[PDB]
Assembly symmetry: D2
Homo-oligomer: 341 residues x 4
Amino acid sequence: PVRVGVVGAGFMGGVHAEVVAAHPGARLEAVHDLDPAAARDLAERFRAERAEPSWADLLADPAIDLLIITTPNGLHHRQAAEALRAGKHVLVEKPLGVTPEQVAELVELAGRHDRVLAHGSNFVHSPKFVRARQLVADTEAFGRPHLVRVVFRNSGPEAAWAASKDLAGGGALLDLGCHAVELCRWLLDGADVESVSARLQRVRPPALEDQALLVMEFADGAVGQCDVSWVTQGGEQVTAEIIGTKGRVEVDLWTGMGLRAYSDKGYQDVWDPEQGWVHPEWEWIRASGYYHQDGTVIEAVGQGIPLTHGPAEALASARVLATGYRSHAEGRVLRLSGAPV
Amino acid sequence: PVRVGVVGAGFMGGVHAEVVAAHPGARLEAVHDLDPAAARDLAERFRAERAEPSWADLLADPAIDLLIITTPNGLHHRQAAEALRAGKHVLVEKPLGVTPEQVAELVELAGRHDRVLAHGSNFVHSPKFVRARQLVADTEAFGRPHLVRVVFRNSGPEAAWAASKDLAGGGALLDLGCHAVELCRWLLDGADVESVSARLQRVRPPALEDQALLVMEFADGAVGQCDVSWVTQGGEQVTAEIIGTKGRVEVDLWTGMGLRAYSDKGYQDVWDPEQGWVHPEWEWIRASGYYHQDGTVIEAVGQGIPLTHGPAEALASARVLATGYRSHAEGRVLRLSGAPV
Amino acid sequence: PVRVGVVGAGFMGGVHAEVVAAHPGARLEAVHDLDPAAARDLAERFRAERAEPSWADLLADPAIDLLIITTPNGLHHRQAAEALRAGKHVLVEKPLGVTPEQVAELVELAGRHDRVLAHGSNFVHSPKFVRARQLVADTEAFGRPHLVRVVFRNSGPEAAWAASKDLAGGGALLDLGCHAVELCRWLLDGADVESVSARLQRVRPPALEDQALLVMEFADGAVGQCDVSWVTQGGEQVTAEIIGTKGRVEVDLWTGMGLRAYSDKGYQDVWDPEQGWVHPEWEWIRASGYYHQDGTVIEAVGQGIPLTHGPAEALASARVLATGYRSHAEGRVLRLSGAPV
Amino acid sequence: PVRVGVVGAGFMGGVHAEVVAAHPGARLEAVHDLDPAAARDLAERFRAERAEPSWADLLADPAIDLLIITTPNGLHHRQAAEALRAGKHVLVEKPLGVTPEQVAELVELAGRHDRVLAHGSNFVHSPKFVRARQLVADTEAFGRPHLVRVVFRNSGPEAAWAASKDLAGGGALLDLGCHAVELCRWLLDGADVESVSARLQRVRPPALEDQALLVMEFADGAVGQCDVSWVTQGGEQVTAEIIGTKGRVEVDLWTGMGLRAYSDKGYQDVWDPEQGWVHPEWEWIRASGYYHQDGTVIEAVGQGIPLTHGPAEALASARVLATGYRSHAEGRVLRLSGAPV
Ligand SMILES: NC(=O)c1ccc[n+]([C@@H]2O[C@H](COP(=O)([O-])OP(=O)(O)OC[C@H]3O[C@@H](n4cnc5c(N)ncnc54)[C@H](O)[C@@H]3O)[C@@H](O)[C@H]2O)c1
Ligand SMILES: NC(=O)c1ccc[n+]([C@@H]2O[C@H](COP(=O)([O-])OP(=O)(O)OC[C@H]3O[C@@H](n4cnc5c(N)ncnc54)[C@H](O)[C@@H]3O)[C@@H](O)[C@H]2O)c1
Ligand SMILES: NC(=O)c1ccc[n+]([C@@H]2O[C@H](COP(=O)([O-])OP(=O)(O)OC[C@H]3O[C@@H](n4cnc5c(N)ncnc54)[C@H](O)[C@@H]3O)[C@@H](O)[C@H]2O)c1
Ligand SMILES: NC(=O)c1ccc[n+]([C@@H]2O[C@H](COP(=O)([O-])OP(=O)(O)OC[C@H]3O[C@@H](n4cnc5c(N)ncnc54)[C@H](O)[C@@H]3O)[C@@H](O)[C@H]2O)c1
């Protein structure tokens, strides 16, 4: 039985807490957060063994097998490192690291300590995305993939820390792009990136990029687009399309639920938009990959099953983003080495 | 651990076998089928303890706690009765009975033997339908429901037995209407039916009805429509709409998955239509309510938790259908007693 | 050049005025309305020769070739009769008459005076509905039609007169049903109605029906449904579906425009809902059949071309509704003669 | 009455012939084509005054006021020049020119001869796109536009000439991009482009690009994407999305018609895909902008009304594409001058 501690009790701490609570092969042992009231809140919502106000004490506890790190991005590196060094397995919310060396160093460290290190690329475990990838891999029907596009848009992060280079490590390209990139590669069966191009925008007044377009050229000839935004109203969008020589497939997470509803007021449990026509959500957490992701990690820690999607894939997406940032600066298409095509 | 035997190893035996095999609180003990090779095959797909070629022996086994009956409708009454008399809990695939007296007799019987009797109204446990119901019950946003419509259409049953009055008990009105009716009433919080009206059609040449419309007048003033068909091409449809004084809720099961795909050929894993634009499916079993339904039954047997949706609800739908059949024959709107409004 | 006068300057007077103004083969000569300020308004918006405050004077004018009657339903009979007797051709907004004898009498009268009498069954001239009918008539692809359903729903008429039996002649069944029925028959190439069944509802507090379901059985075996409502929020709905032995076709007028838009505020020229996700409209008038309808009438008056869709079709739909009203009262399925099937 | 000659009697000659034949303010005088049987055939479909086998004779005819040039792109420059020099007004199908100097030279020329020169940017006159633009220009609802994306994809041109650099002038970027670019700029009220970035692909084996992405940075801060493909199956796509600080607008031409249909066979009048679920089309020519475009040109020639959208706009799009081609070659983001940002 896999004994889990959740580091950081904000939005994603809550998502992971729910999943763990529900997983028969695991137990929610601890909730930690710099703000101890937020940790208590959550230990209670999900019947965690305790709320741990102390980081040192959390790491020292020999009962905890696995930590899930859902703190701001700037902190991932330091805490994942500390947690591995304390002998705990770690799942870190994306971005696993704010730079490729940070990621490389964590992967290296996990090995030293013979630990499972996983990252929060949930959409790659989303049952509907998994299905989508099967269909593109159906060569008779689909042919050779030549285009993949992933769109991730919302009205921006609300936590202050996401506004700071020091705390967030990056703007919308890192927050959302990391996922879009990870998905583009995964959808094409781990395609090798040969070049990267990107432009960034600051749409909102004063600074981190709110909107970005990143484009990858892959070995097989295909091209991948990542279009992400902090600055799009009317509801979170997560979509993808893959186009081949013979087929197409299209995936829609938040408006592909099969539910529409209308009211003047707003419906009790329907985030946003509240009013008029909305697309209520059902099993959002499952649909998004979290149950499956966490289950994989739990099965990995519990019975040394290898991860289907490992932190090497985080290193690749980090290199892509780093190269994307540099491409924007220089106004050029670059190879992963930083060199101008 | 709830020890389960699956009676009838066709299509739905397989669906239920899967769900049981995955449920940590249950074990798939036996698979029975008049055709023993079909039972062997399924015991193997899903690692059942054994294939039981004998019905008497199955009933006599004190190891089996619960039977799931997935045989043709004509056989439900007799086998559920026999199984209850042998002291086994029973989940019967809908229609629970081919007439209201058949249903009544089974409910009575289960009480006599202090047994859990459940029926296969899966859509009522479908997470997206559950969500839909919450929204209609949100009186501030939705207001008073005045119209509910459920549509169930396909290109007709593939098994020969579905062509026979003795084996099927009925045509499309019983095969599909049962579900549509059950949903209408459940979506309106168990609304009482005061009248019923129906017309049936025989679209295909020679006989059981292959298309039907049934309309219910409810106590609170609302009207429910059930539109079902065996004779609709281009893919199974299951949709629902609820309309209130203030709101609307629309639900779409088979084309509310958020996946579209196109090929000339057809995609290896995609039932039908095969070619051109299709709407592939993800977790169809979960989406349809089966994991949740069966979980409720397993929790009901395992720790005497009352069923959220019991066989009383099957008696009501049976009365509605019986009344529907009679209404068509007489050309009139009827009360549940058979009397002409 | 066809010289036109528009009787009644409310909503539909405005629609017809626009169409006429734009038609190269016609001229907008006069606008009449009991309220002369409303007539002046409209003569001005669309550059009509004059506003005519007097009905007697309007009828007497030898310049006017054609009147378009867009007054409340109770008045159609009397004014169409007066206008025909004055030698003017007439297009009457639906319902052409509030009863079948009223319709029969007008058709008879038009003949006496050798006049073109047309009615406002615009959707039957809607280019997208026309296309839909071609596809159903494509026997190789579609097969034999066995089901047709037309849905017409909105949040109800806003003019007071629509609340009065004397002024409106009927509730939602007559206001909306007339169209739905007309469309069902037309979509199936003028199918003969063998029976009719209907239930009506009063959803809003005190009285005319706000919501109705009417069902037709046709000669060829097909069944038609008309589902109409004054009591549906979130935006006017006009949809249709036809299902055959081999095909299906689905038609969507107001959310089949290919435009979505989102705002908090509301967008200047986007009726309703105003706020959140909306489906703006483009060329609504054309899309709805009015340009084509009126053009047919103009071509009929201008160069004695026969009408593609005549006022005989209004007599049939009147008989259907009359029989629908009676069916509801008696609780039975009826033949067009009033006789109980 | 504006007397028109249609140069080139292929697909688009036919589209334009139809529109002209229907326009009360114009007459279809002549059809010319190097292939005189193709010209005869079209003169007949649409009741043209004559088929003109000779180009010199066509230009010399003082009866012809306006030529519509629907020949392959390579020929536009030479024939528009010759036609202007002969004193004829000209509408040239896009691309107006195969390079900016070609376009510039034509604009210059038309001024010299006091002639109306228009180009075939039809989507810019598409009523549904016009509507879309109003909505984005609704600053209260929409805010400041920061992203515009136009997608144009199909399975590639069917005429042989489109395979040749000399005859086509270019691949998919010029054939489709021209329209996508033109739309991006028009949707943002004629926005000034400050930089351009592009990658091209050759998906099909041996050469002209069959897929492209082009990205524009505009003066006001906004970013435009043009995604075009010759190598996308399952049906022509033409879509657009505009995103602002407060709103979004989405437009869909070919699957925003509100018609769906299904058959096994294929429906007699439904291009492609033929089989399974399709999206039949209604008034495709109107919906695409051609009636309105040609009407503007006819009103411009007939009564010297300035064009709402002139050939200056074609020079801008040409500069963008030229810059796009160069950007791909150099691997860099460029200014319109060719200089590296
Ligand atoms: N998978 C996804 O789709 C997704 C979605 C949103 C966010 N995220 C990622 O998840 C992580 C957390 O995001 P979130 O939106 O829940 O943020 P949040 O602001 O809602 O939660 C963060 C919490 O951590 C706390 N915290 C701050 N410093 C800390 C410290 N030193 N030790 C412990 N706790 C500390 C804060 O008080 C806050 O309660 C981020 O890395 C982000 O990139 C992922
Ligand atoms: N709720 C739903 O979603 C849903 C969907 C489909 C079917 N069903 C229901 O499930 C039931 C079975 O449907 P199916 O599609 O699986 O039929 P099927 O043809 O696939 O399977 C029937 C099986 O039962 C076996 N069988 C027949 N008579 C038997 C007997 N007397 N004893 C033991 N085994 C016997 C057959 O050999 C066959 O293997 C039906 O009652 C149907 O109404 C429900
Ligand atoms: N085709 C459609 O889809 C559609 C839609 C709405 C209404 N209609 C029909 O069109 C007709 C008019 O509907 P509307 O919504 O414009 O109503 P409206 O109330 O907007 O307009 C009616 C106008 O006629 C005037 N009027 C009243 N008595 C009159 C008289 N004796 N002489 C002249 N004018 C008089 C009123 O002052 C008002 O200005 C109705 O018959 C209705 O059934 C059709
Ligand atoms: N705006 C749009 O929506 C759109 C759509 C499709 C095509 N187009 C454009 O329209 C133009 C024609 O396209 P199409 O698809 O009709 O090509 P097509 O193959 O259908 O027609 C070309 C015709 O021109 C004739 N022709 C060739 N050379 C000629 C010459 N030198 N003089 C006279 N006639 C000649 C050919 O015999 C043929 O009949 C192209 O420039 C293309 O870019 C525009």
